[PDB]
Amino acid sequence: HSQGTFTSDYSKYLDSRRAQDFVQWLMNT
Known part of the structure; x- marks a missing residue:
C-alpha cells in the first residue's frame, strides 16, 4: 500500500x- 516499498529501491x-x-x-x- 500507501507505505509501499520505495525504500528497498535505493538501499541497494x-x-x-x-x-x-x-x-x-x-x-x-
Missing part, C-alpha cells in the same frame, strides 16, 4: 558505490 545502490569504492583500494595507482 549504496551496495554498489562502496563496491566501486573498494575498486580504489585494490588499485588507486
